Design a protein around this ligand. Structure first.
Ligand SMILES: [Mg+2]
Ligand SMILES: [Zn+2]
Lengths: 556, 51, 1341
DNA sequence: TCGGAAGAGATTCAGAG
RNA sequence: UCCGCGGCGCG
DNA sequence: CTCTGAATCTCTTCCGACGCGCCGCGA
């Protein structure tokens, strides 16, 4: 039925009605002894009607309705992405599910996700009915329903009681690889945003610029045992694509660790001796020494002996206050040398991997959580920030560009004298512009990367710069040499839509203003890339569907 | 309508144990046919089944 | 100099480049095209008159009678625009046409009329564009997107061998009409020429050539060039152009002037050609092999027998040559095949053709076009002729003619819209020339080739469809019956016209629903250009090449504003200055160069002409003489940038910002950031939501004024004067004496849209921003609208931002917000939701609105009146009843035992049930308006009668207040005229106003003016009474509503919504972020003076996204408020205004060579004080897009502000009280809320409804359905060993009609059992497969 | 009441008789 | 309590 | 000079992610 008492007829009903009408017409023309050609025409129409009923559009022009659309025959109910097979037999809609905008929560342990109270109440309403009647607070389902809809705080106590060990599944569309669905043990928060642990968020391929996520609750106890034993994020440390761990920090965590382990030639309290890492932590927190100061410290480490015992060793080593602080969280069994250098992303990755191979799963999990906490805290205390003065422009650049344009004028006038073909003139100009761009990039990196500061004894000495953007790139937290090159050095050649390279490179960097011409020609690459990814997604999805279909039978 | 695309006499009643004629209304006659019409006293689920 | 109004908050410009042309009226395309559509026109060029003349007159031959067209006129729209929006009726006016019917006598000449009848036909109703450029359809705002499509004409195209893949190149030329069949011509890997019609089939071209009235020999003579040979005995001569020799290899000796000279086996070169040309050779003697291998050009006849031995396109058979030479026809004609220049393609087509004659080709074409029927000469001839040459079945519009000629290089510019023989043969010759390689294919993506079609053309096309349908009806009526005893009023049926036009405005793909988040969004949606729609393109078939930027986009289409995702490239926005040429090609302004001095004259160019000339880059520096400083000025020409001397330059760009649209133009510091992020920011800016209180943006772009005024939301001063009166909702302005017209009251009034549902549920409110007695100027803004302050765009808000990682709460673009922001309601927004209640005369008893609800507590009903409607102003929450409605349930017969069971149970099993409207779950708010609409003949209830009474009282008081104000103006004009001389001011003062108007002070033109205004007063009171009578009947009259509904009730619910974690906020440079934490104000980092930060952003995003510009914005913010802070303190100490005056003058002078040059010495001190009052909250800074503030100027401004020169400051962590070792960038930034509030998305379903066919749970939030466990997730589960949860996901939770009941039971009982049945969708699949006639069944039961 | 790839059918060319 | 079709919108 | 097989050409059919959200309309 429809508004106003109308009815939407399914197209199948109309096709059936047409076939019925043609059958009735043919039978009437037969039983009243019609002439030959009339009954032949009627039966040909009937055959065409049956063709329409089964597979309208399979031959010739398709039948159509008032909307000028082709009617969906029976065959169309099974063919195509809207077909019954793909839409319903696979990919069912499901009860006991919710969706919400995700949000960073750093205070969560590894295996627990923050779930809004309202969603929890709605999802577990049947369980709440059950337990509420079981504990005798409600007698009938009507009583339970009216009580839960009034949110009598005893319902909140029951709700806190029910979920205490009840894992839930979190899913992010598209579920590109099996990590896309994971299991978590919920924690109840007021608000309306689902809170994730950032480490697993990195694995989800998710971000926090507004990505939604869906949550399902398992019903049976075998199902929740499966969710705990198989799917819990504490198990999915190793990706299936390769043996390396998937739980790897990025962004602020890596920046914080990098800052914490970087040393400088001269700092507050350099050269003193600390009887233990605890005293290093004290001296830092009391403010009598900066993290970067190099110092000798007494440290104990352990090794897995030939029998399997953690035999101890203790010695004096040269290190930094920050490095001792970080070492204090390291579990027993790893060698101190793992820490005593500027820790980048790859160093942390191999550190987690070596922890997982040397020790069991749970020490690695605890190590990951401690890493996340300490990295965030010390990054915050660091106060790293980016300013306009940081993107230093190498003053050599003007000279190099003047040289390049002089050579361009030289080759152009050489062509004006007819001494060369135009194609080789183009090639020479392109080559000299590329050479100049590389020279400018090298000058920019050299100026940015290192700087001079006074030593303890009162003399100048070079050291790796603490320039913020360089620190972000060098740590591997974010960015790359290409992005830094574009930010400060001249960004160079760009391609016409045909892929050919424009003779005149974009000379201004991002810090100085780009003229309208440079900007306009640059937009070509931007829209090329956006269209590129837009198209690539579909092909990737299609290819994955294929591979899955071919290989789905194979089981050990 | 009788003999129509939705003819209850063929496909069964529109409602559980309700004859089109209104002859019978409850499960006391469950599984019997009406005499005024060929509809059967059964559940609506049969509507999904019968071809 | 500045207007007085603009003296409030004089924004500081920084642009160095002067501006020579103000931005045009932003909506001009829509309004002007619609005006062109509807306005009267004597020449019948466009619109209604053109459409009518293109069909009328209508003549009947057997009837010997004619229908002909006098004129058209458009009636008055019965309803105003706000009435249409309230009552849901399309804003339309009646189409009136003057028509004449003619009957002649039955004797020659047929032109001898005998009777004429004339009358006016109400042939349809047509929508009118509102003043803001949007149509009103039903109850909705709709704006028609102007389409961009391929122009009609002829194009030439090649594929790089992709089809055949052997490495050759294939060519095709296509002709596209405005309407009618396509033709395209194509080559082949075998070099044959083929023609196809609407891409039906593939046929040799000669078929058409002989279908055209040309014979084979004529075809060869026309297409090819001919060479002549002579035979005498057995000596052979040929007649030669020496150039014709070029290309061949001189394998045989060749003679000229009686001497023979050839280097055998060698190719003839230019020295040979010159030798022969100076020889002036004419006829030469050649061997038999040379004439061998040459085609026979035409038929040849032997007179000794009357026989033919030569056919067309035949090779030279030496036997035939001997026979014809002995017969006497010693002359022979042949074609020439240069392997490059003179390909034999047409000859090969003539060889491969199946047809032999004109009629054979005609019938073959007919059977191709019309399969399955016997051909007939008349049928084929009629089909061909009407197809190509019936000017009503096929038409190249005048633009088609222009492009067709100009691509064929013909001198003519105009011509008949139908093709012709010469046109076809010329285009075929051009295609041949392209195949030879003496030309180039056409580039269709080029912007000089595609055309903008506005609303007027689509409207007139649909109206023409209506006209042709009506014409068929009229000719049918003329054929069927008499001609004298009827009037054409009945002959014309309006139904097809109204059907077509309403179908266009409602249904059409380009009639898309309007968006109204903010004035900028409305502007950009009105201006938007779409490549899709009728005759357009499809998202699936759009390849990269149409999406990609084309170098002639510059200055015409903004490259930045395109939407993201699958629609990218296919949707664009007009650049700011681009306007439509009359032919629909885009047009851009330029400044004339005249011998090194820019003339500052303006010329408009299209992509073709722009490509032809040399245009200089905008940022080129100039002297005051107009000479460029640099000699080697950089310019662009023919799609390439280079350097040129001062004299070569032909044109100069008008302004720096002409490459971008408004949406991009708003972004400050655009010249400093990547294109991806700029694109995302430009698109996101549209989604901004208007805040509770507007705020100016500190770092603007000057464009805000133009956009805010040009949009329809703000009330603009249409007539200068002085503001007499203002309240919360009405503005009354006294027009000055000189500006007012004679006989006018000299007073104008405006009424503000106080509160209404926006098209995306946001608020729409107008707030006055003037005070009593302030002068107002023509074009001033009197009342702000949403996101407008003092007439400047006010989308966002100003926030104090520090760039610093903070305890992971800003991890991965997350935003952390200080509670102080929440407490000040900085981002609080007001939302309106509209709910409808429909009362129906349903079967089994009618359904009525009432307060008599069964099975409900009385407290809820107390919120309602006795009629069953909530009182306005009542707070209401989720699950509560707003209006009570009740449905009868039919008989619901109970057996007596069930009757007594019910009786012992209670009042249950009632035949009458609740159906009342309920608050949507989770929503709460306050009820602001209630509306009823009801069918005629039904009684108005208490709520209905009370609201009708209040509405009629409102109408009466409004009309009477208008009367009072306007009569006060009229009598003020009486005073003004009477004081001018012969005064009796006190003698009148004793007399009442009626005496004033009646009495005569003099006997002169003044008394004529008094009489004129007295007649004005009589006329205005009479029109007032007529208006009120019409208003009262219009209010009291009922409504049509819909079938089956007796009465509808609509209730309006308003809700105040608050910033909350999970909400999405973003900044203009395109850095989205979800708010992930609110913080007690104590915990936020605070600077040395103790003022906390408000928003903490992650810095790590900046280098990787390359949004460097935003950092600069931050710095400017810290500078801007800096001055504000200082001036604020300078005000707070209450010192002499002269000191702050000189300080402000310094702050304006601070720029270097800036165009601003504003001086305070002309300002009086109270104006200076008002300026300071507005400047207290910071000094707004204006930075143009590509001529923005430089870093040196930023540093200078900061230094004058006493802030750190680097822009970084020391900072203390509030949570510990310690100090960060690194300096931090803290400044001011402009932030938006993105209308993706968390409470609109959070959703959860334990159980609920289920679908009919599939028995699966419903989908979507509205139906309270569940999420979809898509197949990718199923594969994810399969990757684990997690079988049991998969089985539970499929069977019990989803589709088992009994298993889920069992599961619900067991869960309630506390036992987590499971019992998997069978998915009902599987049974559905089985039944469908069986119904298909294929037997499928289970086995081993 | 569009471009690309693969398969099937039809037509043409070469080799063998 | 509902089959969609078209459209924008965010992932 | 003719017949058959193989090769080539022409015509027809199939396919080009997953997920949510609003609006309109529905002979
Ligand atoms: Mg995302
Ligand atoms: Zn019966």
């Amino acid at each position: 039925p429809l508004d106003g008492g109308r009815f939407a007829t399914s197209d199948l009903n109309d096709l059936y009605r047409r076939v019925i009408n043609r059958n009735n017409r043919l039978k009437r023309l037969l039983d009243l002894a019609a002439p030959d050609i009339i009954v032949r025409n009627e039966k040909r129409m009937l055959q065409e009607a049956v063709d329409a009923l089964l597979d309208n559009g399979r031959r010739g022009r398709a039948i159509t309705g008032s909307n000028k659309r082709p009617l969906k025959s029976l065959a169309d109910m099974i063919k195509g992405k809207q077909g019954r097979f793909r839409q319903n037999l696979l990919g069912k809609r499901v009860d006991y599910s919710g969706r919400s905008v995700i949000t960073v929560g750093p205070y969560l342990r590894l295996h627990q996700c923050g779930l809004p109270k309202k969603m929890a109440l709605e999802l577990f309403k049947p369980f709440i009915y059950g337990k509420l009647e079981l504990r005798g607070l409600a007698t009938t389902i009507k009583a339970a329903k009216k009580m839960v809809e009034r949110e009598e705080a005893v319902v909140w106590d029951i709700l806190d009681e029910v979920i205490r060990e009840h894992p839930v599944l979190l899913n992010r569309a598209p579920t590109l690889h099996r990590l896309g669905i994971q299991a978590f043990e919920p924690v109840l928060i007021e608000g309306k945003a689902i809170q994730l642990h950032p480490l697993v968020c990195a694995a989800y391929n998710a971000d926090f610029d507004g990505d939604q996520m869906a949550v399902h609750v398992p019903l049976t106890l075998e199902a929740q045992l499966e969710a705990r034993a198989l799917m819990m994020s504490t198990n999915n440390i190793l990706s299936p694509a390769n043996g390396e761990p998937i739980i790897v920090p990025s962004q602020d965590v890596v920046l914080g660790l990098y800052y914490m382990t970087r040393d400088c030639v001269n700092a507050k309290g350099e050269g003193m001796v600390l009887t233990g890492p605890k005293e290093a932590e004290r001296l830092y927190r009391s403010g009598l020494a900066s993290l970067h100061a190099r110092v000798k410290v007494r440290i104990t480490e352990y090794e897995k002996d030939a029998n399997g015992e953690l035999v101890a060793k203790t010695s004096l080593k040269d290190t930094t206050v920050g490095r001792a602080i970080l070492w204090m969280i390291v579990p027993k069994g790893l060698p101190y040398s793992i820490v005593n250098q500027a820790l980048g992303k790859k160093a942390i990755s191999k550190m987690l991997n070596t922890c997982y191979r040397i020790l069991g799963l749970k020490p690695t999990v605890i190590f990951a959580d401690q890493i996340m906490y300490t990295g965030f805290a010390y990054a915050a205390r660091s106060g790293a920030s980016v300013g306009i003065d940081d993107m230093v422009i190498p003053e050599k650049k003007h000279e190099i560009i003047s040289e390049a344009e002089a050579e361009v004028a030289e080759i152009q006038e050489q062509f004006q004298s007819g001494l060369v073909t135009a194609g080789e003139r183009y090639n020479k100009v392109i080559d000299i512009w590329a050479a100049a761009n590389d020279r400018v990039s090298k000058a920019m990196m050299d100026n940015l990367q290192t700087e001079t500061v006074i030593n303890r004894d009162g003399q100048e000495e070079k050291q790796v710069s603490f320039n913020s953007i360089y620190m972000m790139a060098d740590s591997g937290a974010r960015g790359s040499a290409a992005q830094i090159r574009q930010l400060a050095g001249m960004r160079g050649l760009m391609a016409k839509p045909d892929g050919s390279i424009i003779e005149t490179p974009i000379t201004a960097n991002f810090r100085e203003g780009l003229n309208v011409l440079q900007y306009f020609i640059s937009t070509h690459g931007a829209r090329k890339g956006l269209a590129d990814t837009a198209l690539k997604t579909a092909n990737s999805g299609y290819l994955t569907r294929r591979l899955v279909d071919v290989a789905q039978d194979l089981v050990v | 309508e009788r003999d129509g695309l939705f003819c209850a006499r063929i496909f069964g009643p529109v409602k559980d144990y309700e004859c089109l004629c209104g002859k019978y209304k409850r499960l006391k006659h469950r599984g019997v046919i009406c005499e005024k019409c060929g509809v059967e006293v059964t559940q609506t689920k049969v509507r999904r089944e019968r071809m | 100099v500045y207007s007085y109004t603009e003296k409030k908050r004089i924004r500081k410009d920084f642009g160095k480049r002067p501006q020579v042309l103000d931005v045009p009226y932003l909506l001009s395309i829509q309004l002007d095209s619609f005006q062109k559509f509807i306005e009267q026109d004597p020449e019948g060029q466009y619109g209604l008159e053109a459409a009518f003349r293109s069909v009328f007159p209508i003549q009947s031959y057997s009837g010997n009678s004619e229908l002909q067209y006098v004129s058209y006129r458009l009636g008055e729209p019965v309803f105003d625009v706000q009435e249409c929006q309230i009552r849901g009726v399309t804003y339309s006016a009646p189409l009136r046409v003057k028509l004449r019917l003619v009957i002649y006598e039955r004797e020659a000449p047929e032109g001898t009329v005998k009777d004429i009848k004339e009358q006016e036909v109400y042939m349809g109703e047509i929508p009118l564009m509102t003043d803001n450029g949007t149509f009103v359809i039903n109850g909705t705002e709709r704006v028609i997107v102007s389409q961009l499509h391929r122009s009609p004409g002829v194009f030439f195209d090649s594929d790089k061998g992709k089809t055949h893949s052997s490495g050759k190149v294939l060519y095709n030329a296509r002709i596209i009409p405005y309407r009618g069949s396509w033709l395209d011509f194509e080559f082949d890997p075998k070099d044959n020429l083929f023609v196809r019609i609407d891409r039906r089939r593939k046929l040799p071209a000669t078929i058409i050539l002989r279908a055209l009235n040309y014979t084979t020999e004529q075809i060869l003579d026309l297409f090819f060039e001919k060479v002549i040979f002579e035979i005498r005995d057995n000596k052979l001569q040929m007649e030669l152009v020496p150039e014709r020799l070029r290309g061949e290899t001189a394998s045989f000796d060749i003679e000229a002037n009686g001497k023979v000279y050839v280097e055998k086996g060698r190719r003839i070169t230019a020295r040979h050609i010159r030798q022969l040309e100076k020889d002036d050779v004419k006829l030469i003697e050649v061997p038999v092999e040379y004439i061998a291998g040459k085609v026979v050009a035409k038929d040849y006849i032997d007179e000794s027998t009357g026989e033919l031995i030569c056919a067309a396109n035949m090779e030279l058979s030496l036997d035939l040559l001997a026979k014809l030479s002995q017969s006497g026809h010693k002359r022979i004609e042949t074609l020439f095949t240069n392997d490059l220049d003179h390909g034999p393609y047409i000859s090969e087509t003539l060889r491969v053709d199946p047809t032999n004659d004109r009629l054979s080709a005609l019938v073959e074409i007919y059977r191709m076009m019309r399969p399955g029927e016997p051909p007939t000469r008349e049928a084929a001839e009629s089909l061909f002729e009407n197809l190509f040459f019936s000017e009503d079945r096929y038409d190249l519009s005048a633009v088609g003619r222009m492009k067709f000629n100009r691509s064929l290089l013909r001198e003519e510019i105009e011509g008949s819209g139908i093709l012709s023989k010469d046109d076809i043969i010329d285009v075929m010759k051009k295609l041949i020339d392209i195949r030879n390689g003496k030309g180039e294919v056409d580039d269709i993506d080029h912007l000089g080739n595609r055309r903008i079609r506005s609303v007027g053309e689509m409207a007139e096309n649909q109206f023409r469809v209506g006209l042709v349908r009506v014409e068929r009806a009229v000719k049918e009526r003329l054929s069927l019956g008499d001609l004298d005893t009827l009037m054409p009023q009945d002959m014309i049926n309006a139904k097809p016209i109204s059907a077509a036009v309403k179908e266009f405005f409602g249904s059409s793909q380009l009639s898309q629903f309007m968006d109204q988040n903010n004035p900028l969004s409305e502007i950009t949606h009105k201006r938007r250009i779409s490549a899709l729609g009728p005759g357009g393109l499809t998202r699936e078939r759009a390849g990269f090449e149409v999406r990609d930027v084309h170098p002639t986009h510059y200055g015409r289409v903004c490259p930045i504003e395109t939407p993201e995702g699958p629609n990218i490239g296919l949707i664009n926005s007009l650049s700011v200055y681009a306007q439509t040429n009359e032919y629909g090609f885009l047009e851009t302004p330029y400044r004339k160069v005249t011998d090194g001095v820019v003339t500052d004259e303006i010329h408009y160019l299209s992509a073709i002409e722009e490509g032809n000339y040399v245009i200089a880059q905008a940022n080129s520096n100039l002297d005051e003489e107009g000479h460029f400083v640099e000699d080697l000025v950089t310019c662009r020409s023919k799609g390439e940038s280079s350097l040129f001397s001062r004299d070569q330059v032909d044109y100069m760009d008008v302004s720096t910002q002409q490459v971008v649209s408004v949406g991009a133009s708003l972004i400050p510091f655009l010249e400093h950031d990547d294109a991806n992020r700029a694109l995302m920011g430009a698109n996101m800016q549209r989604q901004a939501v208007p805040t509770l209180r507007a705020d100016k943006p500190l770092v603007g772009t000057g464009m805000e004024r133009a956009v805010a005024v040009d949009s329809g939301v703000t009330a603009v001063a249409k007539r200068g004067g002085v503001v007499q009166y203002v309240d919360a909702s009405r503005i009354v302005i006294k027009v000055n004496e000189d500006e007012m017209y004679p006989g006018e009251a000299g007073i104008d009034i405006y009424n503000l849209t106080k509160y209404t549902r926006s098209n995306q549920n946001t608020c729409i409110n107008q707030m006055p921003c003037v005070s009593l007695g302030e002068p107002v100027e023509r074009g001033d803004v009197l009342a702000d609208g949403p996101s407008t302050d003092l007439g400047e765009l006010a989308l966002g808000q100003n926030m104090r931002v520090a760039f610093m990682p903070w305890n992971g709460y800003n991890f991965e673009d997350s935003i952390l917000v200080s509670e102080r922001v929440v407490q000040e309601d900085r981002f609080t927004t007001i939302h309106i939701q509209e709910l409808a209640c429909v009362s129906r005369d349903t079967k089994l008893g009618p359904e009525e609105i009432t307060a008599d609800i069964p099975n409900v507590g009385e407290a809820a009903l107390s919120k309602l009146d006795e009629s069953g409607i909530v009182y306005i102003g009542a707070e209401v929450t989720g699950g509560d009843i707003l209006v009570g409605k009740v449905t009868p349930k039919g008989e619901t017969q109970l057996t007596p035992e069930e009757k007594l069971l019910r009786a012992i149970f209670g009042e249950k099993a009632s035949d009458v049930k609740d159906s009342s409207l309920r608050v949507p779950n989770g929503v709460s708010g306050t009820v602001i308006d209630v509306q009823v609409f009801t069918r005629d003949g039904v009684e108005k209830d208490k709520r209905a009668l009370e609201i009708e009474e209040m509405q009629l009282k409102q109408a009466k008081k409004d009309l009477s207040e208008e009367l009072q104000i306007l009569e006060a103006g009229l009598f003020s004009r009486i005073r003004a005229v009477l004081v001018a001389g012969g005064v009796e001011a006190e003698k009148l003062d004793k007399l009442p106003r009626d005496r004033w108007l009646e009495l005569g002070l003099t006997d002169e033109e003044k008394q004529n003016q008094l009489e004129q205004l007295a007649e004005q007063y009589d006329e205005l009171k009479h029109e007032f009474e007529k208006k009120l009578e019409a208003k009262r009947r219009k209010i009291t009259q009922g409504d049509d509503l819909a079938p089956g509904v007796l009465k509808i009730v609509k209730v309006y619910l308003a809700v105040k919504r608050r910033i909350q974690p999970g909400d999405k906020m973003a900044g203009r440079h395109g850095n989205k972020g979800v708010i992930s934490k609110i913080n007690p104000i104590e915990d936020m980092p605070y600077d040395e003076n103790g003022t906390p930060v408000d928003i903490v952003l992650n810095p790590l995003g900046v280098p990787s996204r390359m949004n460097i510009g935003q950092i600069l914005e931050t710095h400017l913010g810290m500078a801007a408020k800096g001055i504000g802070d200082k001036i604020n303190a300078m005000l707070k100490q209450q010192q002499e205004v002269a000191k702050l005056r000189e300080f402000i003058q310094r702050a304006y002078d601070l720029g270097a060579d800036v165009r601003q040059k504003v001086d305070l010495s002309t300002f009086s001190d109270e104006e200076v004080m008002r300026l300071a009052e507005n400047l207290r909250k910071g000094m707004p800074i204006a930075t143009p897009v590509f001529d923005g503030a430089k870093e040196a100027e930023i540093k200078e401004l900061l230094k004058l502000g006493d802030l750190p020169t680097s822009g970084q400051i020391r900072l203390y962590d509030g949570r510990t009280g310690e100090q960060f070792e690194r300096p931090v960038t803290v400044g001011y930034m402009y932030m938006l809320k993105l209308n993706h509030l968390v409470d609109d998305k959070m959703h959860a379903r334990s159980t609920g409804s289920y679908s009919l066919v599939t028995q699966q749970p419903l989908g979507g939030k509205a139906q309270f359905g569940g999420q979809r466990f898509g197949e990718m997730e199923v594969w994810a589960l399969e990757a684990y060993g997690a079988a049991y949860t998969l089985q539970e996901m499929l069977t019990v939770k989803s589709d088992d009609v009994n298993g889920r009941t069992k599961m619900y039971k067991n869960i309630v009982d506390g036992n987590h059992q499971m019992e998997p049945g069978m998915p009902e969708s599987f049974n559905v699949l089985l039944k469908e497969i069986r119904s298909l006639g294929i037997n499928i069944e289970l086995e081993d039961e």
